[PDB]
Enzyme design. Structure first.
Site, PDB file in Angstrom:
ATOM      1  CG  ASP A   1      52.030  34.133  29.744  1.00 31.46           C
ATOM      2  OD1 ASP A   1      53.058  33.831  30.386  1.00 31.46           O
ATOM      3  OD2 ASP A   1      52.015  35.035  28.880  1.00 31.46           O
ATOM      4  CB  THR A   2      53.580  31.628  35.014  1.00 30.46           C
ATOM      5  OG1 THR A   2      54.790  31.491  34.263  1.00 30.46           O
ATOM      6  CG2 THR A   2      52.908  30.278  35.139  1.00 30.46           C
ATOM      7  N   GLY A   3      53.754  34.388  33.054  1.00 32.18           N
ATOM      8  CA  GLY A   3      54.328  35.702  32.874  1.00 32.18           C
ATOM      9  C   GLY A   3      53.337  36.816  32.654  1.00 32.18           C
TER      10      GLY A   3
HETATM   11  C1  LIG Z   1      58.560  40.103  28.452  1.00 34.70           C
HETATM   12  C2  LIG Z   1      57.045  40.005  28.181  1.00 34.70           C
HETATM   13  C3  LIG Z   1      56.217  39.741  29.455  1.00 34.70           C
HETATM   14  C4  LIG Z   1      56.612  40.610  30.685  1.00 34.70           C
HETATM   15  C5  LIG Z   1      57.042  42.063  30.387  1.00 34.70           C
HETATM   16  C6  LIG Z   1      54.706  39.942  29.232  1.00 34.70           C
HETATM   17  N1  LIG Z   1      54.025  38.984  28.346  1.00 34.70           N
HETATM   18  C7  LIG Z   1      53.904  37.628  28.917  1.00 34.70           C
HETATM   19  C8  LIG Z   1      54.708  36.581  28.133  1.00 34.70           C
HETATM   20  O1  LIG Z   1      54.423  35.334  28.770  1.00 34.70           O
HETATM   21  C9  LIG Z   1      54.472  36.519  26.610  1.00 34.70           C
HETATM   22  C10 LIG Z   1      53.231  35.723  26.191  1.00 34.70           C
HETATM   23  C11 LIG Z   1      53.014  35.720  24.695  1.00 34.70           C
HETATM   24  C12 LIG Z   1      53.058  34.518  23.983  1.00 34.70           C
HETATM   25  C13 LIG Z   1      52.856  34.535  22.611  1.00 34.70           C
HETATM   26  F1  LIG Z   1      52.899  33.363  21.940  1.00 34.70           F
HETATM   27  C14 LIG Z   1      52.611  35.694  21.902  1.00 34.70           C
HETATM   28  C15 LIG Z   1      52.577  36.867  22.642  1.00 34.70           C
HETATM   29  F2  LIG Z   1      52.340  38.016  21.975  1.00 34.70           F
HETATM   30  C16 LIG Z   1      52.770  36.916  24.010  1.00 34.70           C
HETATM   31  N2  LIG Z   1      55.651  35.849  26.025  1.00 34.70           N
HETATM   32  C17 LIG Z   1      56.562  36.491  25.231  1.00 34.70           C
HETATM   33  O2  LIG Z   1      56.501  37.646  24.889  1.00 34.70           O
HETATM   34  O3  LIG Z   1      57.527  35.618  24.805  1.00 34.70           O
HETATM   35  C18 LIG Z   1      58.468  35.931  23.727  1.00 34.70           C
HETATM   36  C19 LIG Z   1      59.690  35.154  24.158  1.00 34.70           C
HETATM   37  O4  LIG Z   1      59.336  33.799  23.814  1.00 34.70           O
HETATM   38  C20 LIG Z   1      58.661  33.778  22.540  1.00 34.70           C
HETATM   39  O5  LIG Z   1      57.536  32.965  22.370  1.00 34.70           O
HETATM   40  C21 LIG Z   1      56.291  33.695  22.499  1.00 34.70           C
HETATM   41  C22 LIG Z   1      56.605  35.176  22.335  1.00 34.70           C
HETATM   42  C23 LIG Z   1      58.134  35.231  22.395  1.00 34.70           C
HETATM   43  S1  LIG Z   1      52.742  39.656  27.475  1.00 34.70           S
HETATM   44  O6  LIG Z   1      52.104  38.568  26.730  1.00 34.70           O
HETATM   45  O7  LIG Z   1      53.303  40.804  26.777  1.00 34.70           O
HETATM   46  C24 LIG Z   1      51.514  40.307  28.626  1.00 34.70           C
HETATM   47  C25 LIG Z   1      50.387  39.551  28.942  1.00 34.70           C
HETATM   48  C26 LIG Z   1      49.452  40.067  29.829  1.00 34.70           C
HETATM   49  C27 LIG Z   1      49.616  41.334  30.409  1.00 34.70           C
HETATM   50  C28 LIG Z   1      48.541  41.836  31.372  1.00 34.70           C
HETATM   51  C29 LIG Z   1      47.671  43.005  30.891  1.00 34.70           C
HETATM   52  O8  LIG Z   1      49.114  42.176  32.643  1.00 34.70           O
HETATM   53  C30 LIG Z   1      50.754  42.072  30.078  1.00 34.70           C
HETATM   54  C31 LIG Z   1      51.701  41.567  29.189  1.00 34.70           C
END
Ligand code: A1CM6
Lengths: 99, 99
Positions: free
Chosen positions: B25-27
């Protein structure tokens, strides 16, 4: 370009005549943008993340220029903390991960 | 390896003698994993994403072998919907985005 991950991978995008910064997010299956008007019709949708779920408007066939690379696809607009480019659009510009 | 994004970038990880699959996860700035039994002391912390926040257990200097590459760093353990390898560890295995 090749992007290292020592900082947040943000890129400039051109969408709906507006300029924004978005996060290239390989962990996101879908593209999610903060509130705007993507011209045309939409359909209500619910998406989930780490914290729970949010209500977004699903807009289809939206043009988006990600760092000069053109792509059309589904764009969801809603209360996301940050703009995120998902895998639906990343595949179109040919983006890949490289160890 | 070079990874295309037509599917979720899932990889196998070894952590605490346990085999798991995680999302590159690059995000994500830091690594967050679903509930498990990781040995040692921890410290409560709150992290947020789409939909809100979750309370996680923070572990420091944890070894992880990601797709054959070892890395040491902080791993947050809590109610994440999916295992995610964040940028804190992606940089150690030499991960880069390329488009
Ligand atoms: C905007 C959110 C983003 C930035 C603010 C932060 N996130 C990253 C992002 O890559 C998530 C990954 C993800 C994948 C999944 F399958 C299930 C999940 F719960 C999370 N993707 C996401 O939310 O995607 C949405 C849209 O696409 C759909 O598919 C999948 C979910 C739907 S985070 O995971 O919250 C996060 C991780 C680590 C940290 C540390 C501590 O720093 C903080 C925050």
């Amino acid at each position: 370009p090749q992007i290292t991950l020592w900082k947040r991978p943000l890129v400039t995008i051109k969408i709906g005549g507006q300029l924004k910064e978005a996060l290239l997010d390989t962990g996101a299956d879908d593209t999610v943008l903060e509130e705007m008007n993507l011209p045309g019709r939409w359909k209500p949708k619910m998406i989930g993340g780490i914290g729970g779920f949010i209500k977004v408007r699903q807009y289809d066939q939206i043009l988006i220029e990600i760092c000069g690379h053109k792509a059309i696809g589904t764009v969801l607009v809603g209360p996301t903390p940050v703009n995120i480019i998902g895998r639906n659009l990343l595949t179109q510009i040919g983006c890949t991960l490289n160890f």
